[PDB]
Design a protein around this nucleic acid. Sequence first.
RNA 1: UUGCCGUUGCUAUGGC
Lengths: 434, 126, 102, 49, 171, 121, 134
Amino acid sequence: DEYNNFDAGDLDKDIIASRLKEDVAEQQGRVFRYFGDKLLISEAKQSFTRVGENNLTCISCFQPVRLFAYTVSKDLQLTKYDITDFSKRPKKLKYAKGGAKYIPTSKHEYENTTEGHYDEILTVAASPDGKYVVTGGRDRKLIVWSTESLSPVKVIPTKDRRGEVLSLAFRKNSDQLYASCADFKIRTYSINQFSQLEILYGHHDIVEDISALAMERCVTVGARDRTAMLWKIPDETRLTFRGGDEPQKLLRRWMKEPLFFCEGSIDVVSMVDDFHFITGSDNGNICLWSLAKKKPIFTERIAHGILPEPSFNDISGETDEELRKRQLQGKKLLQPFWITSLYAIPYSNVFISGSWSGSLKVWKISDNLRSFELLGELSGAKGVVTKIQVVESGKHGKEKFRILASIAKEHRLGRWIANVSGARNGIYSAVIDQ
Amino acid sequence: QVLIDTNFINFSIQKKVDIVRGMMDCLLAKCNPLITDCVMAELEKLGPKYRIALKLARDPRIKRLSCSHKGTYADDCLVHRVLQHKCYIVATNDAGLKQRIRKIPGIPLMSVGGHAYVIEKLPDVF
Amino acid sequence: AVTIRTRKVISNPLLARKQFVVDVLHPNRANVSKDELREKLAEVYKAEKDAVSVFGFRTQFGGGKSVGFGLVYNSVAEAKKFEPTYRLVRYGLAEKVEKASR
Amino acid sequence: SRVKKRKKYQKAQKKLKSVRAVYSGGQSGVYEGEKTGIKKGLTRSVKFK
Amino acid sequence: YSTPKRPYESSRLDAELKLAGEFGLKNKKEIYRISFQLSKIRRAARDLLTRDEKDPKRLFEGNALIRRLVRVGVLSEDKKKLDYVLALKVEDFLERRLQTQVYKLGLAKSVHHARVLITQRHIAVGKQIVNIPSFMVRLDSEKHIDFAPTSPFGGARPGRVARRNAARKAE
Amino acid sequence: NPKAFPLADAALTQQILDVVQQAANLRQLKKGANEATKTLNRGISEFIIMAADCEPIEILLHLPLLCEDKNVPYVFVPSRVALGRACGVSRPVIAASITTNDASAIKTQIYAVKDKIETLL
Amino acid sequence: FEDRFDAREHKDRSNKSRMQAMEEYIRESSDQPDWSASIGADIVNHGRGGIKSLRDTEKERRVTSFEEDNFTRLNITNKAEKRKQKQRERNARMNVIGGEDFGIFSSKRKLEDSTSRRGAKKTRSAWDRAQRRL
RNA sequence: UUGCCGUUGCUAUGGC
Ligand SMILES: [Zn+2]
């Protein structure tokens, strides 16, 4: 570096970059709420309210800048909850059941403007101004309900025969919704204007999970392509982040002197700032990813442990224990609890991971943003975690959070899930503090 | 898999086209040039005026079949094992063998013409 | 319905103006409908409807979006003073005709 | 000029069942029989040399 | 494009008959266009083989050529050698066109049904409705060939024949 | 030697499961145990994917007998829940078969996996 | 002798040693992702073009960013377009198959003789090669 | 704390 190091073009662009407007939504702010070790762990108030609905599916919450959450079930029922009382269970405000009354009388695609659901409402999203909630599922519709009445004020179809929506995310502090349809599509809607802005294509299996933050960017992940993409929606472009853990070379890394293996399906995302995200995979991987690297920065190989081995009384039907124990092939058929719900508090140091391992796991990323660590475990949620999110209260130095998570006995998309070891269906609420 | 005979070898040496590189240049593919034992016996019988051709046919890259029939008549050996199987290319320059091979169907035919090889009954050369 | 999106809003007070680029998103519509779009821009900002103008409309292949150049004013007086005559005879209120001869 | 070559190919793979015996796709259902005759005099195989 | 050396031999006439009938092509100029650029491609791969190992030309242009052939789709993921580029041939290149790919993906009952679907604008790969059948869809665009959103075989309104029949059955 | 003998390890398992999902998307897949034996004795089958951890194992050990009869490759995949997820259904399947189609956009994938498990066997 | 100002002696030419083979290898082994588009929006005349080339989409990004940066639609300047646009579409439809160009493998340009084998730091002494290695 | 049924708290759990 010399004494003269100016470029005429660059000082011109900084003149224009001073002259412009909108230093508002484009905040490329990294993690600033560095509170990973500051809060406690082992004294969270774990209140599990068991609710009377088979197979809840997702939770949308709300904070302004009273407080309500929302739930949605496989029994075609949305139910609104007050959660503004921070130390008790949520309370039921309005149920809302769809069913056979709202199957259309036409069986044709454009006139799917029936005012309710009839099959498997999959995700829900409450507006940042709270006026509306939106929810959708395998009835190829998005239904927008009012807050104060829970009426469908608009029904927008996805308009094709495989238009199952599978994840919804409002971008923060705006009225724009990104819904990740199983047509390898992302549809964007303006909810105060009731319009569709952009459809945008590009995944290779069904776009199972979506997440958004303060900017117009988005992060989506598809099931078995094992890639996670992020989208610039004004520029309509994307970055693709493949996986890339080879079990043979990880065996070689241990064989320098071990049940870790390949990758099936990336399941869940949550965007942690405007420069990183975390993806939860099918072999229990949790991976932390930059914006400047294809391959992930950090991988946690197994995050929720390994499924119990199949019983010798239920493996073959031979008479002797020796041959029934022979038919397990040793460790060859042990499979892990796949991380199936992942959530980040925005711009924070902590995140939450959940499956049917029975215990949620709170983790904190390191300060340098190159690794993460288990903080603690939350052993009050028996069952599959179909959604995790966090509600906050209190100012910057002292704050108190309640993890609202939904627990069912079956996965949110297909069933596939046996060995219900005493699981129940309801809302887990863990109030952690400081 | 390109079955060569003796006047293909002699014409390639008289034109200075290499065997494997000339076949790769002609077909734009890969080639296994093959010398049957009767073609090799015909080259050895042709005398010591053809020692150059003999030790250019003894090449490591040129693989070699082993024909099991009495005597050393290369044209009947090539015609029999080519109408047997329909998977070979016949590389030759005999007028008689070229007329036999271009009368039987589905057998391509390579020949030294000009200053590199030409190929006749193969319909995908470009 | 027709939705609008402003980008790269800069302020040019030397011409007493604020200029920007407009993404016009119309699903299954014909095209932008420049007048109705100017009313929508007059509503989404402070009003100044006869002071706002958009001129650089380019649709894309297959419809869906269009990209244009919007420029909102204050003070319709300087809108007349600075916005040129061809745009004013398109949209606004100046009109000039020429003695075509030779 | 496309539906010409659509049909002079359907003629072409109908003439091909007269020279060769073209692989149809395997046994349809139950095996009924040969349906066209068994000739015990004719042997259609390639003798060697 | 350019005609072959011997264009009228009976082997080549049966070749063109079989390719046109199997892939639903219109004339010989599709085969000659595709085979012209394929001749250029494996003419390049031949010279990249005629220079030996460790050469900057062979190394960089070889990995460039096989990676962009995989990305076009005519090569597989696991043949990353510069001799499968020589083993390439014409029907690998015209198995990738949108007409064949619609027929394979089951949006039509024939290759000619696929051809008329594409030229009557019911097939849209990604966003754009494609009208031409000779498209060479790539490996990434392979899975997003689907019926257009403006198409009565997709989710849109019936066409003029069906809704004129609805009008005539209304009167 | 256990009863579910050619158990495909991690790489071959996700390879198999990717071609199973693509065949189910293109309607070339027939899923279930007695559907698999129906298509195995019918003849529309390239290769057949059984699970290695169903609740008994002999419920689908009835299949490799038909496979060695009719020269069809068979592979035990280590999770029936994963195989149901791959097939794309809402219940864990234990056996699936890839029906023979020639107009198929995934023939090279099906054939590469078939050759790999023929080497495995 | 004496000093003369020369923009061609401190000008960003930077195109005498860009080769698509080398940039393709750098993009493969970069480990930074590459901003691909949504998969439909890249084909052009409903397919009647190509998809479009990488040089085409970077040039198009430059034209629309210059467009959104100083507010000006371009023109139909006929000599310029009658050469460059018809020659551009003709080399595109001859060489670019499936959105990937293949003319770089059928054109004579020596890769080592402009792109590798550095010229100033040629290390023309054994002491220099030992020092620069260590 | 709900579809029910039970232990109930005078609030937690467990079986479908
Ligand atoms: Zn012989």
